[PDB]
Amino acid sequence: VSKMPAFLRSALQILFSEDSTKLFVASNQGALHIVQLSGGSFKHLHAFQPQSGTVEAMCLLAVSPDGNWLAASGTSAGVHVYNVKQ
Amino acid sequence: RDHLRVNLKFLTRTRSTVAESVSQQILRQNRGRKACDRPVFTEEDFQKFQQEYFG
Amino acid sequence: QNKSYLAVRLKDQDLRDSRQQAAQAFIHNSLYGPGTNRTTVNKFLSLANKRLPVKRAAVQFLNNAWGIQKKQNAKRFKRRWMV
Amino acid sequence: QRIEREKKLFVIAQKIQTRKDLMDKTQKVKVKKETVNSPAIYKFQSRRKR
Amino acid sequence: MLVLFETSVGYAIFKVLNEKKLQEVDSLWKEFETPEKANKIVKLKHFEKFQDTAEALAAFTALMEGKINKQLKKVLKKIVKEAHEPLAVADAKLGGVIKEKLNLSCIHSPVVNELMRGIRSQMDGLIPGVEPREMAAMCLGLAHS
Amino acid sequence: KYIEMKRVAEAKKIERLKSELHLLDFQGKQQNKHVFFFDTKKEVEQFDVA
Amino acid sequence: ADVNPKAYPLADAHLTKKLLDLVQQSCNYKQLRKGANEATKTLNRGISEFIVMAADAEPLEIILHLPLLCEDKNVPYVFVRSKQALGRACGVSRPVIACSVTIKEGSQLKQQIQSIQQSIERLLV
Amino acid sequence: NVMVEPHRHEGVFICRGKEDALVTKNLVPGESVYGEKRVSISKIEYRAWNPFRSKLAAAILGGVDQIHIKPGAKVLYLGAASGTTVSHVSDIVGPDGLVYAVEFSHRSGRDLINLAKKRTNIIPVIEDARHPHKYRMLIAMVDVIFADVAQPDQTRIVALNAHTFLRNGGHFVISIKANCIDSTASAEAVFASEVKKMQQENMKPQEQLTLEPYERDHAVVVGVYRPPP
Amino acid sequence: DLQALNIKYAMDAFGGPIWSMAASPSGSQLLVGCEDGSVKLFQITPDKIQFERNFDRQKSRILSLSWHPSGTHIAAGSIDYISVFDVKSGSAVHKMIVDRQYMGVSKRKCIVWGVAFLSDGTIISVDSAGKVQFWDSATGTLVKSHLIANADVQSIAVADQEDSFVVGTAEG
């Protein structure tokens, strides 16, 4: 793909949904990026804000097979679940 | 007045150079004299002959 | 003279440091250079095979790069042998 | 011309100095022969000066 | 925050107006680009002037080996100690020595060093009283002594 | 002492002459590498000395 | 310890042995000038490779003119702790506070002199 | 009988005739600083600039594109020594310019003060270049920094001085001796490493020239510091 | 930086490649040994590190460092020798010669791979000859040697209570 945004430069974790439409990226500093992928074209939909709390471990990402939910960990607060559609 | 044409003629026609022998002698004296500064018969012929002739 | 003047981009001419290379070479000769007592991993793992109740051969029996032309002639001689 | 005069005068002074060193009773061995550019080099026997 | 700036003519004490701009060190160079913007960031609270080069020699020898004079004692206690505000200093040793000799807190930081660079660049336009001729003549006398 | 007295004096004469003879228009085997730096690739191909 | 700080290029024990050995070799080849007065003259004539001084002169100032002259001619210089040791290396029955190794055409010590010259400048960092 | 040609660098001239000399206009007519000879044309006197002794003169004769030392400019000079090159710089910048001569050696400092007495535009600073904060009172914001200290961490010394006294968009001229940085490594390898270190600070080297005819194992790097966006 | 999971900064020591680094008993200072033979002291500022002072330059590269537990003395290992330094004036009080072979001489140079220092005054050293050696700091002389391996002994570590230590060798 020709171009990518600069904020994806150092990803801790890369995850693909059950469909190819959505791409999930965790940044080295706390941030979640959702990218809309359609026909070799990328659109940055949303950037979830860093989770509150002291960083305890490397980030881990899980996606539900329906695509509705995204679970992320790596902080002392606990595992956070995000609604992709909302 | 534009002096570009005049300056070009005076800066090119007068071409002269010192000799290489002149320049190489000047550059070596500048170097200095300190240690840091400064830069058909074989034994086979003789040995075989005395075996064959006097051996 | 075009050879005297050279144009270079700022990031390309950055290469490996020669001083760093000498540092790596010193470590290599100190640990795997002449005068040390080093064996191969194949030989080192084959010492157990000589002491087993059933003796086996070397762990890696085939040497890939010992010979290539000699390997073909052995196959040619073998095919002749079955006639 | 002046530079070439300097080179010759440096050689001449050393050869006279080298000849002056020879006027010594201490034993010596020649290790090099004299040349146009350099004087002969000698090594002297090691005795302390009393 | 008060900041102390040393020049050949005397001691200069400035006050920073926009403390928010100091947080972004990378963007601070834009504020001191022109004399209009620099006066919006800092203003001169007080300037104590050296009368002659013999007195100035007595001052700056002490400063650069981490010691303060009797006169520099008086300037600090009036301008900086009566006010309740941190004092930026370009020397960590000088800020350390001030803490014991006077009950005063000194801050040294890379953002402070960036603030020192901006004031020096806009040296004319920040002190209106001192003439350019007095600055140049005082520099020659102090340098030779 | 006679040779050295002459040698040191004309040696200083050599240094004095070299202070106003700067070997302008030197042509020799030694040629110095002059290197220019550019941020972008396009400047590198489009480089022209003149 | 208890060394005058003005003798800054103070060689350690290992370099001292290399220095005094080379000085003793230079004596055998007639390539050494002994004494502060004779050492000064070689610097003025520009025929010296390096200068060795003794750090234990009771007034140290009697040799401090030599470092100034060496910096003009760009000649390396070092200090050793004992003038008695320097005197015996020079082959003299008396203490020596300064010595100079001179320039010789065709000298066999050229490789050793160059190695010592390189070692000295390392002390100047 | 002398004919004088303008040089590409402002304030610098080249003198031909009986002498093949690079010259600058004398700021103090009738005076010689270190025994250099002088010539007059008609009213105007010039002083010869020895390339064998000076390194800036060697770079100019070597074909450098820019020196950035111009009339009416403020120059911070690191490694002033006796002031032979400082005197020619004081000629170029003229009465409007200022030269700050920093030298740590005491014997070389005594020659600077005698030179500084006769030239008003020279400001002598007998301090150590490794601590620019110890003389911040004397130096205002400057335009060009010239460094000839010949000392292994020269790059760090320049960067500390550039951060305190060099304006945005200012230029630096640095002389590098290969065997001083590392005696055993090759000259071109040493020079490239210094180029890398300059890029680590906000210094962009723009050119590099070696001083082959008058010196050996020397290079000059000219660049800009904190270039404007 | 552990929190941001990135490198805060990299600073050039300007002494060539660095072979070893040791922190002082207090965390305020850092000691660096380089290829050129110089020992450098860095003060640790709240945000970065600042170069402070150079000790006396040694003839060969410095491969291992150790601090006196009170912080007054330094031990540094190098090819064929160990150097003891005083922190107040960075001068080598003692140079200790290490024999290339155990009670013998060999053409192969001896490399001191690690140095550990005890409060009583003893220096423990491990070398490529395969022996662990005890030295006295006051006199600068060897006290005891222990031959333990036929290959290099490469690593040293001492517990906080100076009653136990551990060595690691090339044979595993």
UniProtKB/Swiss-Prot annotation, chain A:
It comes from the Eukaryota. It is found in: Nucleus, Nucleolus; Chromosome. May be phosphorylated during mitosis; may control the association of this protein with WRD43 and UTP15. WD repeats lie at residues 1-46, 47-86. Ribosome biogenesis factor. Involved in nucleolar processing of pre-18S ribosomal RNA. Part of the small subunit (SSU) processome, first precursor of the small eukaryotic ribosomal subunit. During the assembly of the SSU processome in the nucleolus, many ribosome biogenesis factors, an RNA chaperone and ribosomal proteins associate with the nascent pre-rRNA and work in concert to generate RNA folding, modifications, rearrangements and cleavage as well as targeted d Involved in SSU pre-rRNA processing at sites A', A0, 1 and 2b. (Microbial infection) Acts as a positive regulator of HIVEP1 which specifically binds to the DNA sequence 5'-GGGACTTTCC-3' found in enhancer elements of numerous viral promoters such as those of HIV-1, SV40, or CMV. Interacts with HIVEP1 Interacts with NOL11. Part of the small subunit (SSU) processome, composed of more than 70 proteins and the RNA chaperone small nucleolar RNA (snoRNA) U3. May be a component of the proposed t-UTP subcomplex of the ribosomal small subunit (SSU) processome containing at least UTP4, WDR43, HEATR1, UTP15, WDR75.
UniProtKB/Swiss-Prot annotation, chain B:
Disulfide bonds: none annotated. Part of the small subunit (SSU) processome, first precursor of the small eukaryotic ribosomal subunit. During the assembly of the SSU processome in the nucleolus, many ribosome biogenesis factors, an RNA chaperone and ribosomal proteins associate with the nascent pre-rRNA and work in concert to generate RNA folding, modifications, rearrangements and cleavage as well as targeted degradation of pre-ribosomal RNA by the RNA exosome. Acts as a chaperone that specifically mediates the integration of RPS19 in state post-A1. Direct regulator of SIRT1. Part of the small subunit (SSU) processome, composed of more than 70 proteins and the RNA chaperone small nucleolar RNA (snoRNA) U3. Interacts with RPS19; the interaction is direct and mediates the integration of RPS19 in state post-A1. Interacts with SIRT1. Widely expressed (at protein level). It comes from Homo sapiens (Human). The gene is RPS19BP1. The modification Phosphoserine is found at S16. It is found in: Nucleus, Nucleolus. Belongs to the AROS family. Citrullinated by PADI4. This is Active regulator of SIRT1. The chain holds residues 69 to 135 of 136 of the full protein.
Swiss-Prot record, chain G:
It is found in: Nucleus; Nucleus, Nucleolus. The keyword Lipid biosynthesis does not apply. One of its GO terms (cellular component) is small-subunit processome. PROSITE patterns: RIBOSOMAL_L7AE. The record marks E58, K83 as: Interaction with U4 snRNA and U4atac snRNA. The modification N6-acetyllysine is found at K18. Residues 93-125 are annotated as: Important for U4 snRNA-binding. SUPFAM superfamilies: L30e-like (SSF55315). Residues 33-45 are annotated as: Interaction with U4 snRNA and U4atac snRNA. It comes from the Eukaryota. Pfam families: Ribosomal_L7Ae. Changing A54F: Abolishes U4 snRNA-binding. The modification Phosphoserine is found at S119. Ubiquitous. This is NHP2-like protein 1. The lineage of its organism: Eukaryota, Metazoa, Chordata, Craniata, Vertebrata.
From Swiss-Prot, chain H:
Ubiquitinated. Ubiquitination leads to proteasomal degradation. Deubiquitinated by USP36. By homology to other fibrillarins, some or all of the N-terminal domain arginines are modified to asymmetric dimethylarginine (DMA). GO terms for cellular component: box C/D methylation guide snoRNP complex; Cajal body; extracellular exosome; fibrillar center; granular component; membrane; nucleolus; nucleoplasm. One of its GO terms (biological process) is box C/D sno(s)RNA 3'-end processing. S-adenosyl-L-methionine binds at T84, T85, E103, F104, D128, A129, D148, V149, A150, Q151. It comes from the Eukaryota. It is an enzyme of class 2 (transferase). Its EC number is 2.1.1.-. The modification Phosphoserine is found at S32, S40, S42. Residues 186-218 are annotated as: Helical. GO terms for molecular function: ATPase binding; histone H2AQ104 methyltransferase activity; RNA binding; rRNA methyltransferase activity; TFIID-class transcription factor complex binding; U6 snRNA 2'-O-ribose methyltransferase activity. Keywords: Acetylation, Isopeptide bond, Methylation, Methyltransferase, Nucleus, Phosphoprotein, Ribonucleoprotein, RNA-binding, rRNA processing, S-adenosyl-L-methionine, Transferase, Ubl conjugation. The keyword S-adenosyl-L-methionine applies. The modification N6-acetyllysine is found at K18, K37, K117, K118. The keyword Hydrolase does not apply. It is found in: Nucleus, Nucleolus; Nucleus, Nucleoplasm. Its main location: nucleus. This is rRNA 2'-O-methyltransferase fibrillarin. It comes from Homo sapiens (Human). The gene is FBL. The chain holds residues 85 to 317 of 321 of the full protein.
